[PDB]
């Protein structure tokens, strides 16, 4: 009656994990190696298809994490190494007019540096931040060392390599496809009844930050609360805003870049001095916009924790500076901003905010071992305007009051940041070969 008929080109797929390649329109993320993008990339809507999606088991996040770390190492490899800088520093307090906010944050350190000739040395002086300098001994000898000299080698970032994130697209190789959930109220996990296939993901900027998601995607209609297990306080809650909150971060100090020849063709870039006054770096956010955004976040959290539960926001309970502050890179400078005024509110069911920011010039990105980076100073004054598009929050566990929930900023694992952009994308492999009964028999 019925006979096996073989079909090739069947629109069937399986869950898969593969190596997705790159498409992009002197950069950290290479960009030359990454394939050029194609205009008007095709998007095809799959009608009558419901596909399960898990953001919390998406291998695109792990691949992006590995790729960004590897690209960072590759960018750092050919740049000037600053191993000679591990010498005794003689540091005094800056003698210019310094605001109380900054009195003791910046030190003027003198040291004996090498030159292009191995038999000569030079006496030089550089300005260093207090979060990059360690007292050599407890006694008041005024002799100090760089923070990394005991644990890690330090490499200077190439001044010609910009730290501005640029959008990148992750593309499937032939035989694989990227499925995009188009549901606008998608909680991250579960069936998606509105699916499309794409050649590549949208433009994702690999912005590195903690506690606030910057320059990301916005929720289409409502604030989205996504968590792998909302009952598990060990997992982070990703909040995606439906409206951005504008944050204006500045390093007010006018800055100079002093070039010191430390080898035959190696230059070290020191801060040198500040023209004009010395003022603390800081970020401004609108008070009303932030307050309405927090009201919306609370409204969405009550859908998981109860209509009558008190929602409290408080500052980070602990961790390193990268996770107790809002850390980010803008303008080439690394800011560590105190968000204690962003999360300082109790919400019962019934102007601008200025965040002080500290600067470091010695950065250990991620948590690698034995490798640090010196960030060269940027000349001039840095002014930065960014969109806050989401939060990474942790719920306080072990509560002794069941009528109140407390949420604190978290971060430090960038897979939670890049999972906030890749949450809607899934990689599948195509199974074009299939069999089915028909009435056709081979002669």
């Amino acid at each position: 009656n019925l006979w096996v008929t073989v079909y090739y080109g069947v629109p069937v797929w399986k869950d898969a994990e593969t190596t997705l390649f790159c498409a992009s329109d002197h950069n950290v993320w290479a960009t030359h190696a990454c394939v050029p993008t194609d205009p008007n990339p095709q998007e095809i809507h799959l009608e009558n298809v419901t596909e399960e999606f898990n953001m919390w088991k998406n291998n695109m996040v792990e691949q992006m994490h590995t790729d960004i770390i590897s690209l960072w190492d590759q960018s750092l490899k050919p740049c000037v190494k600053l191993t000679p800088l591990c010498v005794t520093l003689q540091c005094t307090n800056v003698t210019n007019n310094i605001t109380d906010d900054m009195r003791g944050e910046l030190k003027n350190c003198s040291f004996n540096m090498t030159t292009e000739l191995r038999d000569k040395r030079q006496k030089v002086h550089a300005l260093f931040y207090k979060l990059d300098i360690v007292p050599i001994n407890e006694n008041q000898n005024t002799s100090y060392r760089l923070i990394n000299c005991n644990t890690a080698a330090i490499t200077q970032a190439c001044p010609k390599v910009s730290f501005e994130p640029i959008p990148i697209h992750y593309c499937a190789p032939a035989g694989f496809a990227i499925l995009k959930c188009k549901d606008k109220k998608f909680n991250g996990t579960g069936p998606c009844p509105s699916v499309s296939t794409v050649q590549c993901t949208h433009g994702i900027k690999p912005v590195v930050s903690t506690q606030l998601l910057l320059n990301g995607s916005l929720a289409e209609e409502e604030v989205m609360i996504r968590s792998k297990d909302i009952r598990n306080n060990a997992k982070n809650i990703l909040v995606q805003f439906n409206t951005p909150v504008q944050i204006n971060c500045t390093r007010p100090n006018n800055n100079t870049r002093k070039s010191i020849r430390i080898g035959p063709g190696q230059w070290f870039y020191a801060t040198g001095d500040i023209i004009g006054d010395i003022r603390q770096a800081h970020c401004n956010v609108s008070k009303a916009t932030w307050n309405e955004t927090l009201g919306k976040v609370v409204k969405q959290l009550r859908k998981h924790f109860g209509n009558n539960t008190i929602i409290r926001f408080a500052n980070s309970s602990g961790g390193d500076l990268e996770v107790t502050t809002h850390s980010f890179n803008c303008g080439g400078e690394f800011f560590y901003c105190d968000t204690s005024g962003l999360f300082n509110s109790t919400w019962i069911s019934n102007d601008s905010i200025t965040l002080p920011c500290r600067i470091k010039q010695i950065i250990n990105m991620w948590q690698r071992i034995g490798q640090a980076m010196y960030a060269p100073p940027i000349q001039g004054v840095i002014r930065c305007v960014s969109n806050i598009t989401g939060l990474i929050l942790t719920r306080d566990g072990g509560s002794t009051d069941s009528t109140t929930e407390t949420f604190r900023p978290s971060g430090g694992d960038m897979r939670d940041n890049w999972r906030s952009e890749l949450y809607k994308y899934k990689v599948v492999k195509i199974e074009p070969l299939g069999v089915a009964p028909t009435r056709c028999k081979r002669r």
């Epitope: 961790g319 390193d320 430090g412």
Partner: antibody, heavy 121, light 103 residues
């Protein structure tokens, strides 16, 4: 072999600080959350908090929030818990425990020996 | 918040059943309920994880289930090495503790 080795027992006066270490071995340190749980003699188990040894982020119970600090060092693979301003009832056996994976499961596969801290005048 | 009997008792050869009762509602939060066994003097060990799973190397005697708010362990085949403290856990909450006395 996965092992957790804690510091030895300590005697403290009220108002002092106590810092208990936990050296881990046999697994990738950054791949599992570290939890601190205390048990007073003759009573049940009380969870104190967790630290993410990768991101360094922490989470403290409300009973200890404001007094307890948790830190980690990935170079020497050691987790630390510090209680300030001890009181008389704070005497307990403080255990460090390794989560089976990266913060998803709370059934602790491995435990330390337990550091007995006694607080008295 | 996870009440437990103060003590339980059995005879060698028969079976015992410990119960853990949760004040909170069901709200599908009881999927991850683990059990611990604390031989006096040592650090707890895990007998059940996620209501009715067993760590590799744990004897089949220990076996728990769940019913709504309540969730129980069954030590079937009680020996003399069962004089421990048995604690139910849901994430961070620990049970109050049951001392299983062998007779």
């Amino acid at each position: 072999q996965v092992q957790l080795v804690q510091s030895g027992a300590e005697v403290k006066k009220p108002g002092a600080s106590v810092k208990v270490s936990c050296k881990a071995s046999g697994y990738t340190f950054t791949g599992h959350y570290m939890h601190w749980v205390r048990q007073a003699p003759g009573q049940g188990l009380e969870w104190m908090g967790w630290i993410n040894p990768y991101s360094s982020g922490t989470n403290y119970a409300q009973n200890f929030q404001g007094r307890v600090t948790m830190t980690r060092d990935t170079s020497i693979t050691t987790a630390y818990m510090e209680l300030s301003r001890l009181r008389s009832d704070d005497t307990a056996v403080y255990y460090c425990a390794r989560a089976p994976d990266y913060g998803d499961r709370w059934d602790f596969d491995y435990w330390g020996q337990g550091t007995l801290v006694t607080v008295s005048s | 918040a996870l009440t437990q009997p103060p003590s339980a008792s059995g005879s060698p050869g028969q079976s015992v059943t410990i119960s853990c009762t949760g004040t909170s509602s069901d709200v599908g939060g009881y999927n991850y309920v683990s059990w611990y066994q604390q031989h006096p003097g040592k650090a707890p060990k895990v007998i059940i994880y996620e209501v009715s799973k067993r760590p590799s190397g744990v004897p089949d005697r220990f076996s728990g289930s769940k019913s709504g708010n309540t969730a129980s362990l069954t030590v079937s085949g009680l020996q003399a090495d069962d004089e421990a403290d048995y604690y139910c856990s849901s994430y961070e909450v620990f049970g109050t503790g049951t001392k299983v006395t062998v007779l």
